[PDB]
Amino acid sequence: CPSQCSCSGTTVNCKSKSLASVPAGIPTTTRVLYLNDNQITKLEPGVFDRLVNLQTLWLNNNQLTSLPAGLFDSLTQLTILALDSNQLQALPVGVFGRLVDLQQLYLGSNQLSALPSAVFDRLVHLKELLMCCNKLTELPRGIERLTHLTHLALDQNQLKSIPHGAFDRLSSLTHAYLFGNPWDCECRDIMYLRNWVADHTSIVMRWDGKAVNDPDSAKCAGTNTPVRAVTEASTSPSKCP
Ligand SMILES: CC(=O)N[C@H]1[C@H](O[C@H]2[C@@H](O)[C@@H](CO)O[C@@H](O[C@H]3[C@H](O)[C@@H](O)[C@@H](O)O[C@@H]3CO)[C@@H]2O)O[C@H](CO)[C@@H](O[C@@H]2O[C@H](CO)[C@H](O)[C@H](O)[C@H]2O)[C@@H]1O
């Protein structure tokens, strides 16, 4: 056990310990690793290579700005990875490529404006993808193939539309967060999101400390009128960015 942390069973608790770096002494037997709520500014390559039994890894609420390539490649049994509330500016290609059993991925509250094109291609069992509070301008490629998603959080980004058909195979969705985006309702491309929301009013959620069903929470930029109320006649292909 790291001297700054407490350990019990296969759980290592390094949460809220004012840590500036990942401490030594985490047993290779560890299955749950709390490193959240610290001041970790970077993760060294190979730091997780020894921890092949991890199933849940909490790196949220730190000061991470980048991740080295291959950082997680040994964590083949990982099912939850939390990276929210950091300062991640970009991700390397294949950063999640080996996390084939991952079920929950937290990326909200970073500085991401795009993702590598194949970032989710191997996450065939993913159920929750929460990426609020970044600066995304397009739906990341690959999300349309995460057919097992129950939770998809895209709120508080910079999305203007959703590519046609992107949500149609996400038939297990129960929670979709779309508020806080500047949806461009004069552009003809908004019609897919409009049509999809109108058919899935029960799964569009707002957030006041918790999920609250609100299909009007996806709002048009400027008028702040509901996206699902847009008429096609009011839109035009020539009014798109
Ligand atoms: C990894 C994760 O669960 N992230 C979500 C985040 O989790 C916070 C929540 O569990 C609260 C519950 O009290 O605890 C916070 O942790 C505390 C900790 O308990 C304290 O002892 C001390 O250490 O400080 C930390 C941090 O303050 C967890 O961080 O909760 C937020 C919402 O508050 C979620 O973000 C929302 O996600 C929604 C989709 O699910 C939606 O997009 C919404 O807009 C987001 O705000 C994190 O996903």
PDB file of N, CA and C in Angstrom, residues 53-139:
ATOM      1  N   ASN A  53      -5.063  -6.237 -13.398  1.00  0.00           N
ATOM      2  CA  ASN A  53      -6.327  -6.722 -12.863  1.00  0.00           C
ATOM      3  C   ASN A  53      -7.331  -5.614 -12.598  1.00  0.00           C
ATOM      4  N   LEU A  54      -6.997  -4.368 -12.923  1.00  0.00           N
ATOM      5  CA  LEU A  54      -7.914  -3.263 -12.665  1.00  0.00           C
ATOM      6  C   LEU A  54      -9.226  -3.458 -13.412  1.00  0.00           C
ATOM      7  N   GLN A  55     -10.332  -3.277 -12.696  1.00  0.00           N
ATOM      8  CA  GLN A  55     -11.642  -3.224 -13.320  1.00  0.00           C
ATOM      9  C   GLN A  55     -12.261  -1.838 -13.287  1.00  0.00           C
ATOM     10  N   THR A  56     -11.842  -0.989 -12.354  1.00  0.00           N
ATOM     11  CA  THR A  56     -12.405   0.343 -12.195  1.00  0.00           C
ATOM     12  C   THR A  56     -11.280   1.303 -11.837  1.00  0.00           C
ATOM     13  N   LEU A  57     -11.142   2.376 -12.610  1.00  0.00           N
ATOM     14  CA  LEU A  57     -10.043   3.326 -12.458  1.00  0.00           C
ATOM     15  C   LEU A  57     -10.599   4.741 -12.438  1.00  0.00           C
ATOM     16  N   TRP A  58     -10.425   5.435 -11.313  1.00  0.00           N
ATOM     17  CA  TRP A  58     -10.952   6.785 -11.128  1.00  0.00           C
ATOM     18  C   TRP A  58      -9.800   7.782 -11.159  1.00  0.00           C
ATOM     19  N   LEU A  59      -9.671   8.494 -12.275  1.00  0.00           N
ATOM     20  CA  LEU A  59      -8.691   9.559 -12.413  1.00  0.00           C
ATOM     21  C   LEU A  59      -9.348  10.929 -12.488  1.00  0.00           C
ATOM     22  N   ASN A  60     -10.640  11.013 -12.179  1.00  0.00           N
ATOM     23  CA  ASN A  60     -11.383  12.256 -12.296  1.00  0.00           C
ATOM     24  C   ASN A  60     -10.922  13.284 -11.260  1.00  0.00           C
ATOM     25  N   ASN A  61     -11.182  14.558 -11.564  1.00  0.00           N
ATOM     26  CA  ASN A  61     -10.840  15.686 -10.694  1.00  0.00           C
ATOM     27  C   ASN A  61      -9.340  15.720 -10.390  1.00  0.00           C
ATOM     28  N   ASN A  62      -8.554  15.808 -11.456  1.00  0.00           N
ATOM     29  CA  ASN A  62      -7.119  16.028 -11.341  1.00  0.00           C
ATOM     30  C   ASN A  62      -6.736  17.181 -12.265  1.00  0.00           C
ATOM     31  N   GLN A  63      -5.472  17.218 -12.662  1.00  0.00           N
ATOM     32  CA  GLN A  63      -4.958  18.289 -13.499  1.00  0.00           C
ATOM     33  C   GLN A  63      -4.273  17.723 -14.732  1.00  0.00           C
ATOM     34  N   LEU A  64      -4.833  16.653 -15.295  1.00  0.00           N
ATOM     35  CA  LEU A  64      -4.250  16.023 -16.473  1.00  0.00           C
ATOM     36  C   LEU A  64      -4.545  16.841 -17.722  1.00  0.00           C
ATOM     37  N   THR A  65      -3.508  17.097 -18.519  1.00  0.00           N
ATOM     38  CA  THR A  65      -3.673  17.808 -19.776  1.00  0.00           C
ATOM     39  C   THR A  65      -3.481  16.929 -20.998  1.00  0.00           C
ATOM     40  N   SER A  66      -2.770  15.812 -20.866  1.00  0.00           N
ATOM     41  CA  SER A  66      -2.629  14.862 -21.955  1.00  0.00           C
ATOM     42  C   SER A  66      -2.427  13.471 -21.375  1.00  0.00           C
ATOM     43  N   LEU A  67      -2.592  12.469 -22.234  1.00  0.00           N
ATOM     44  CA  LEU A  67      -2.346  11.086 -21.887  1.00  0.00           C
ATOM     45  C   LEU A  67      -1.336  10.499 -22.864  1.00  0.00           C
ATOM     46  N   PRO A  68      -0.318   9.786 -22.394  1.00  0.00           N
ATOM     47  CA  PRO A  68       0.618   9.163 -23.332  1.00  0.00           C
ATOM     48  C   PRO A  68      -0.029   7.991 -24.053  1.00  0.00           C
ATOM     49  N   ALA A  69       0.410   7.777 -25.291  1.00  0.00           N
ATOM     50  CA  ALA A  69      -0.111   6.675 -26.086  1.00  0.00           C
ATOM     51  C   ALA A  69       0.188   5.343 -25.408  1.00  0.00           C
ATOM     52  N   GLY A  70      -0.791   4.439 -25.437  1.00  0.00           N
ATOM     53  CA  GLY A  70      -0.637   3.125 -24.844  1.00  0.00           C
ATOM     54  C   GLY A  70      -0.768   3.070 -23.338  1.00  0.00           C
ATOM     55  N   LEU A  71      -1.138   4.183 -22.694  1.00  0.00           N
ATOM     56  CA  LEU A  71      -1.227   4.249 -21.236  1.00  0.00           C
ATOM     57  C   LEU A  71      -2.087   3.133 -20.649  1.00  0.00           C
ATOM     58  N   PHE A  72      -3.215   2.821 -21.289  1.00  0.00           N
ATOM     59  CA  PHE A  72      -4.194   1.893 -20.739  1.00  0.00           C
ATOM     60  C   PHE A  72      -4.153   0.510 -21.384  1.00  0.00           C
ATOM     61  N   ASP A  73      -3.165   0.231 -22.237  1.00  0.00           N
ATOM     62  CA  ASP A  73      -3.235  -0.945 -23.099  1.00  0.00           C
ATOM     63  C   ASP A  73      -3.216  -2.265 -22.335  1.00  0.00           C
ATOM     64  N   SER A  74      -2.695  -2.287 -21.109  1.00  0.00           N
ATOM     65  CA  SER A  74      -2.677  -3.518 -20.333  1.00  0.00           C
ATOM     66  C   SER A  74      -3.979  -3.773 -19.585  1.00  0.00           C
ATOM     67  N   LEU A  75      -4.886  -2.799 -19.528  1.00  0.00           N
ATOM     68  CA  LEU A  75      -6.050  -2.873 -18.641  1.00  0.00           C
ATOM     69  C   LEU A  75      -7.236  -3.527 -19.353  1.00  0.00           C
ATOM     70  N   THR A  76      -7.013  -4.765 -19.806  1.00  0.00           N
ATOM     71  CA  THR A  76      -8.003  -5.460 -20.622  1.00  0.00           C
ATOM     72  C   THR A  76      -9.262  -5.829 -19.851  1.00  0.00           C
ATOM     73  N   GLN A  77      -9.219  -5.830 -18.523  1.00  0.00           N
ATOM     74  CA  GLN A  77     -10.388  -6.147 -17.715  1.00  0.00           C
ATOM     75  C   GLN A  77     -11.118  -4.907 -17.214  1.00  0.00           C
ATOM     76  N   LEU A  78     -10.689  -3.716 -17.624  1.00  0.00           N
ATOM     77  CA  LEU A  78     -11.292  -2.478 -17.144  1.00  0.00           C
ATOM     78  C   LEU A  78     -12.731  -2.354 -17.635  1.00  0.00           C
ATOM     79  N   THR A  79     -13.643  -2.008 -16.724  1.00  0.00           N
ATOM     80  CA  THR A  79     -15.028  -1.749 -17.089  1.00  0.00           C
ATOM     81  C   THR A  79     -15.475  -0.316 -16.845  1.00  0.00           C
ATOM     82  N   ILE A  80     -14.827   0.417 -15.944  1.00  0.00           N
ATOM     83  CA  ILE A  80     -15.132   1.823 -15.710  1.00  0.00           C
ATOM     84  C   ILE A  80     -13.837   2.618 -15.763  1.00  0.00           C
ATOM     85  N   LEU A  81     -13.824   3.676 -16.574  1.00  0.00           N
ATOM     86  CA  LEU A  81     -12.703   4.607 -16.642  1.00  0.00           C
ATOM     87  C   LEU A  81     -13.239   6.025 -16.526  1.00  0.00           C
ATOM     88  N   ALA A  82     -12.846   6.725 -15.467  1.00  0.00           N
ATOM     89  CA  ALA A  82     -13.305   8.083 -15.209  1.00  0.00           C
ATOM     90  C   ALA A  82     -12.149   9.051 -15.411  1.00  0.00           C
ATOM     91  N   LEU A  83     -12.318   9.975 -16.352  1.00  0.00           N
ATOM     92  CA  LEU A  83     -11.331  11.003 -16.646  1.00  0.00           C
ATOM     93  C   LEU A  83     -11.949  12.393 -16.610  1.00  0.00           C
ATOM     94  N   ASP A  84     -13.158  12.526 -16.076  1.00  0.00           N
ATOM     95  CA  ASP A  84     -13.841  13.806 -16.100  1.00  0.00           C
ATOM     96  C   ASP A  84     -13.194  14.789 -15.124  1.00  0.00           C
ATOM     97  N   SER A  85     -13.485  16.070 -15.336  1.00  0.00           N
ATOM     98  CA  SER A  85     -12.916  17.171 -14.556  1.00  0.00           C
ATOM     99  C   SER A  85     -11.389  17.120 -14.533  1.00  0.00           C
ATOM    100  N   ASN A  86     -10.805  17.046 -15.724  1.00  0.00           N
ATOM    101  CA  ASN A  86      -9.384  17.307 -15.885  1.00  0.00           C
ATOM    102  C   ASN A  86      -9.210  18.484 -16.836  1.00  0.00           C
ATOM    103  N   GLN A  87      -8.049  18.601 -17.468  1.00  0.00           N
ATOM    104  CA  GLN A  87      -7.816  19.643 -18.456  1.00  0.00           C
ATOM    105  C   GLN A  87      -7.306  19.034 -19.752  1.00  0.00           C
ATOM    106  N   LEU A  88      -7.823  17.857 -20.104  1.00  0.00           N
ATOM    107  CA  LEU A  88      -7.387  17.171 -21.313  1.00  0.00           C
ATOM    108  C   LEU A  88      -7.699  17.997 -22.552  1.00  0.00           C
ATOM    109  N   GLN A  89      -6.659  18.311 -23.313  1.00  0.00           N
ATOM    110  CA  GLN A  89      -6.794  19.086 -24.534  1.00  0.00           C
ATOM    111  C   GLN A  89      -6.913  18.228 -25.782  1.00  0.00           C
ATOM    112  N   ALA A  90      -6.417  16.997 -25.742  1.00  0.00           N
ATOM    113  CA  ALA A  90      -6.559  16.079 -26.861  1.00  0.00           C
ATOM    114  C   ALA A  90      -6.281  14.670 -26.358  1.00  0.00           C
ATOM    115  N   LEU A  91      -6.713  13.687 -27.142  1.00  0.00           N
ATOM    116  CA  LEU A  91      -6.397  12.295 -26.881  1.00  0.00           C
ATOM    117  C   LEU A  91      -5.526  11.716 -27.993  1.00  0.00           C
ATOM    118  N   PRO A  92      -4.616  10.804 -27.666  1.00  0.00           N
ATOM    119  CA  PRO A  92      -3.826  10.139 -28.706  1.00  0.00           C
ATOM    120  C   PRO A  92      -4.624   9.042 -29.398  1.00  0.00           C
ATOM    121  N   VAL A  93      -4.165   8.691 -30.600  1.00  0.00           N
ATOM    122  CA  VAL A  93      -4.813   7.637 -31.370  1.00  0.00           C
ATOM    123  C   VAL A  93      -4.730   6.323 -30.607  1.00  0.00           C
ATOM    124  N   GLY A  94      -5.860   5.627 -30.515  1.00  0.00           N
ATOM    125  CA  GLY A  94      -5.906   4.311 -29.909  1.00  0.00           C
ATOM    126  C   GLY A  94      -5.853   4.274 -28.400  1.00  0.00           C
ATOM    127  N   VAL A  95      -6.092   5.403 -27.726  1.00  0.00           N
ATOM    128  CA  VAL A  95      -5.914   5.455 -26.277  1.00  0.00           C
ATOM    129  C   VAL A  95      -6.829   4.459 -25.566  1.00  0.00           C
ATOM    130  N   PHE A  96      -8.008   4.184 -26.124  1.00  0.00           N
ATOM    131  CA  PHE A  96      -8.922   3.207 -25.544  1.00  0.00           C
ATOM    132  C   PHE A  96      -8.989   1.916 -26.355  1.00  0.00           C
ATOM    133  N   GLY A  97      -8.045   1.699 -27.271  1.00  0.00           N
ATOM    134  CA  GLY A  97      -8.170   0.618 -28.236  1.00  0.00           C
ATOM    135  C   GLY A  97      -8.193  -0.777 -27.638  1.00  0.00           C
ATOM    136  N   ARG A  98      -7.581  -0.962 -26.470  1.00  0.00           N
ATOM    137  CA  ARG A  98      -7.499  -2.277 -25.851  1.00  0.00           C
ATOM    138  C   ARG A  98      -8.496  -2.476 -24.718  1.00  0.00           C
ATOM    139  N   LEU A  99      -9.293  -1.464 -24.383  1.00  0.00           N
ATOM    140  CA  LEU A  99     -10.250  -1.570 -23.283  1.00  0.00           C
ATOM    141  C   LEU A  99     -11.556  -2.193 -23.788  1.00  0.00           C
ATOM    142  N   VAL A 100     -11.434  -3.421 -24.304  1.00  0.00           N
ATOM    143  CA  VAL A 100     -12.552  -4.041 -25.008  1.00  0.00           C
ATOM    144  C   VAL A 100     -13.724  -4.353 -24.088  1.00  0.00           C
ATOM    145  N   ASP A 101     -13.500  -4.442 -22.780  1.00  0.00           N
ATOM    146  CA  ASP A 101     -14.576  -4.721 -21.839  1.00  0.00           C
ATOM    147  C   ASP A 101     -15.132  -3.467 -21.179  1.00  0.00           C
ATOM    148  N   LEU A 102     -14.702  -2.282 -21.613  1.00  0.00           N
ATOM    149  CA  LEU A 102     -15.117  -1.050 -20.953  1.00  0.00           C
ATOM    150  C   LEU A 102     -16.624  -0.860 -21.070  1.00  0.00           C
ATOM    151  N   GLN A 103     -17.257  -0.511 -19.950  1.00  0.00           N
ATOM    152  CA  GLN A 103     -18.689  -0.252 -19.919  1.00  0.00           C
ATOM    153  C   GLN A 103     -19.044   1.208 -19.688  1.00  0.00           C
ATOM    154  N   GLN A 104     -18.236   1.945 -18.931  1.00  0.00           N
ATOM    155  CA  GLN A 104     -18.495   3.352 -18.653  1.00  0.00           C
ATOM    156  C   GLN A 104     -17.235   4.158 -18.919  1.00  0.00           C
ATOM    157  N   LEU A 105     -17.394   5.274 -19.626  1.00  0.00           N
ATOM    158  CA  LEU A 105     -16.294   6.167 -19.972  1.00  0.00           C
ATOM    159  C   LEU A 105     -16.715   7.592 -19.657  1.00  0.00           C
ATOM    160  N   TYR A 106     -15.994   8.234 -18.743  1.00  0.00           N
ATOM    161  CA  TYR A 106     -16.278   9.598 -18.316  1.00  0.00           C
ATOM    162  C   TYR A 106     -15.219  10.525 -18.894  1.00  0.00           C
ATOM    163  N   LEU A 107     -15.651  11.478 -19.725  1.00  0.00           N
ATOM    164  CA  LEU A 107     -14.742  12.440 -20.337  1.00  0.00           C
ATOM    165  C   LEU A 107     -15.213  13.879 -20.171  1.00  0.00           C
ATOM    166  N   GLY A 108     -16.275  14.107 -19.407  1.00  0.00           N
ATOM    167  CA  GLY A 108     -16.824  15.437 -19.272  1.00  0.00           C
ATOM    168  C   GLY A 108     -15.884  16.403 -18.580  1.00  0.00           C
ATOM    169  N   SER A 109     -16.165  17.693 -18.777  1.00  0.00           N
ATOM    170  CA  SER A 109     -15.449  18.777 -18.100  1.00  0.00           C
ATOM    171  C   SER A 109     -13.945  18.699 -18.356  1.00  0.00           C
ATOM    172  N   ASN A 110     -13.585  18.608 -19.633  1.00  0.00           N
ATOM    173  CA  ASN A 110     -12.198  18.749 -20.049  1.00  0.00           C
ATOM    174  C   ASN A 110     -12.066  19.897 -21.043  1.00  0.00           C
ATOM    175  N   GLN A 111     -11.048  19.846 -21.898  1.00  0.00           N
ATOM    176  CA  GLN A 111     -10.840  20.833 -22.951  1.00  0.00           C
ATOM    177  C   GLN A 111     -10.791  20.163 -24.316  1.00  0.00           C
ATOM    178  N   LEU A 112     -11.603  19.130 -24.510  1.00  0.00           N
ATOM    179  CA  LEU A 112     -11.600  18.403 -25.768  1.00  0.00           C
ATOM    180  C   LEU A 112     -12.453  19.133 -26.797  1.00  0.00           C
ATOM    181  N   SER A 113     -11.874  19.393 -27.967  1.00  0.00           N
ATOM    182  CA  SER A 113     -12.615  19.949 -29.087  1.00  0.00           C
ATOM    183  C   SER A 113     -12.814  18.951 -30.218  1.00  0.00           C
ATOM    184  N   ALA A 114     -12.185  17.779 -30.141  1.00  0.00           N
ATOM    185  CA  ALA A 114     -12.374  16.684 -31.084  1.00  0.00           C
ATOM    186  C   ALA A 114     -11.762  15.430 -30.478  1.00  0.00           C
ATOM    187  N   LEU A 115     -12.063  14.295 -31.094  1.00  0.00           N
ATOM    188  CA  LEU A 115     -11.528  13.008 -30.693  1.00  0.00           C
ATOM    189  C   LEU A 115     -10.929  12.316 -31.906  1.00  0.00           C
ATOM    190  N   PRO A 116      -9.927  11.460 -31.705  1.00  0.00           N
ATOM    191  CA  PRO A 116      -9.432  10.639 -32.815  1.00  0.00           C
ATOM    192  C   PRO A 116     -10.568   9.850 -33.449  1.00  0.00           C
ATOM    193  N   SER A 117     -10.445   9.614 -34.753  1.00  0.00           N
ATOM    194  CA  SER A 117     -11.575   9.116 -35.526  1.00  0.00           C
ATOM    195  C   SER A 117     -12.002   7.714 -35.098  1.00  0.00           C
ATOM    196  N   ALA A 118     -11.068   6.884 -34.640  1.00  0.00           N
ATOM    197  CA  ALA A 118     -11.370   5.517 -34.244  1.00  0.00           C
ATOM    198  C   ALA A 118     -11.401   5.344 -32.731  1.00  0.00           C
ATOM    199  N   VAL A 119     -11.658   6.424 -31.989  1.00  0.00           N
ATOM    200  CA  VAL A 119     -11.446   6.418 -30.545  1.00  0.00           C
ATOM    201  C   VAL A 119     -12.339   5.399 -29.841  1.00  0.00           C
ATOM    202  N   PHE A 120     -13.562   5.179 -30.332  1.00  0.00           N
ATOM    203  CA  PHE A 120     -14.496   4.252 -29.695  1.00  0.00           C
ATOM    204  C   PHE A 120     -14.662   2.937 -30.449  1.00  0.00           C
ATOM    205  N   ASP A 121     -13.883   2.702 -31.510  1.00  0.00           N
ATOM    206  CA  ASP A 121     -14.199   1.615 -32.435  1.00  0.00           C
ATOM    207  C   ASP A 121     -14.128   0.242 -31.771  1.00  0.00           C
ATOM    208  N   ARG A 122     -13.319   0.088 -30.724  1.00  0.00           N
ATOM    209  CA  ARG A 122     -13.172  -1.207 -30.076  1.00  0.00           C
ATOM    210  C   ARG A 122     -14.059  -1.371 -28.847  1.00  0.00           C
ATOM    211  N   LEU A 123     -14.746  -0.313 -28.413  1.00  0.00           N
ATOM    212  CA  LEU A 123     -15.549  -0.349 -27.189  1.00  0.00           C
ATOM    213  C   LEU A 123     -16.937  -0.906 -27.515  1.00  0.00           C
ATOM    214  N   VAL A 124     -16.950  -2.189 -27.885  1.00  0.00           N
ATOM    215  CA  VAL A 124     -18.161  -2.803 -28.409  1.00  0.00           C
ATOM    216  C   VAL A 124     -19.201  -3.048 -27.318  1.00  0.00           C
ATOM    217  N   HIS A 125     -18.808  -3.023 -26.044  1.00  0.00           N
ATOM    218  CA  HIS A 125     -19.739  -3.245 -24.942  1.00  0.00           C
ATOM    219  C   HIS A 125     -20.062  -1.976 -24.156  1.00  0.00           C
ATOM    220  N   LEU A 126     -19.649  -0.804 -24.637  1.00  0.00           N
ATOM    221  CA  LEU A 126     -19.854   0.433 -23.889  1.00  0.00           C
ATOM    222  C   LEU A 126     -21.336   0.709 -23.658  1.00  0.00           C
ATOM    223  N   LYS A 127     -21.685   1.055 -22.417  1.00  0.00           N
ATOM    224  CA  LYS A 127     -23.057   1.403 -22.071  1.00  0.00           C
ATOM    225  C   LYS A 127     -23.260   2.867 -21.709  1.00  0.00           C
ATOM    226  N   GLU A 128     -22.257   3.544 -21.157  1.00  0.00           N
ATOM    227  CA  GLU A 128     -22.409   4.939 -20.759  1.00  0.00           C
ATOM    228  C   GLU A 128     -21.224   5.740 -21.276  1.00  0.00           C
ATOM    229  N   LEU A 129     -21.511   6.767 -22.067  1.00  0.00           N
ATOM    230  CA  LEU A 129     -20.504   7.693 -22.574  1.00  0.00           C
ATOM    231  C   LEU A 129     -20.910   9.101 -22.164  1.00  0.00           C
ATOM    232  N   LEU A 130     -20.206   9.674 -21.193  1.00  0.00           N
ATOM    233  CA  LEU A 130     -20.575  10.978 -20.649  1.00  0.00           C
ATOM    234  C   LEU A 130     -19.475  11.984 -20.964  1.00  0.00           C
ATOM    235  N   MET A 131     -19.766  12.903 -21.882  1.00  0.00           N
ATOM    236  CA  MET A 131     -18.807  13.878 -22.394  1.00  0.00           C
ATOM    237  C   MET A 131     -19.393  15.282 -22.380  1.00  0.00           C
ATOM    238  N   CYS A 132     -20.020  15.671 -21.271  1.00  0.00           N
ATOM    239  CA  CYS A 132     -20.509  17.036 -21.161  1.00  0.00           C
ATOM    240  C   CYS A 132     -19.342  18.012 -21.106  1.00  0.00           C
ATOM    241  N   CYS A 133     -19.668  19.292 -21.250  1.00  0.00           N
ATOM    242  CA  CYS A 133     -18.813  20.365 -20.755  1.00  0.00           C
ATOM    243  C   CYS A 133     -17.424  20.339 -21.397  1.00  0.00           C
ATOM    244  N   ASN A 134     -17.380  20.033 -22.690  1.00  0.00           N
ATOM    245  CA  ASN A 134     -16.166  20.206 -23.474  1.00  0.00           C
ATOM    246  C   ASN A 134     -16.410  21.252 -24.554  1.00  0.00           C
ATOM    247  N   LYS A 135     -15.679  21.169 -25.664  1.00  0.00           N
ATOM    248  CA  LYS A 135     -15.810  22.137 -26.746  1.00  0.00           C
ATOM    249  C   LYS A 135     -16.017  21.444 -28.091  1.00  0.00           C
ATOM    250  N   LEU A 136     -16.690  20.297 -28.084  1.00  0.00           N
ATOM    251  CA  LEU A 136     -16.903  19.539 -29.310  1.00  0.00           C
ATOM    252  C   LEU A 136     -17.793  20.304 -30.280  1.00  0.00           C
ATOM    253  N   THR A 137     -17.403  20.315 -31.553  1.00  0.00           N
ATOM    254  CA  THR A 137     -18.195  20.972 -32.581  1.00  0.00           C
ATOM    255  C   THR A 137     -18.891  20.006 -33.524  1.00  0.00           C
ATOM    256  N   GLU A 138     -18.569  18.720 -33.458  1.00  0.00           N
ATOM    257  CA  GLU A 138     -19.228  17.699 -34.253  1.00  0.00           C
ATOM    258  C   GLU A 138     -19.353  16.469 -33.379  1.00  0.00           C
ATOM    259  N   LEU A 139     -20.356  15.652 -33.666  1.00  0.00           N
ATOM    260  CA  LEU A 139     -20.491  14.375 -32.989  1.00  0.00           C
ATOM    261  C   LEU A 139     -19.280  13.511 -33.323  1.00  0.00           C
TER     262      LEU A 139
END
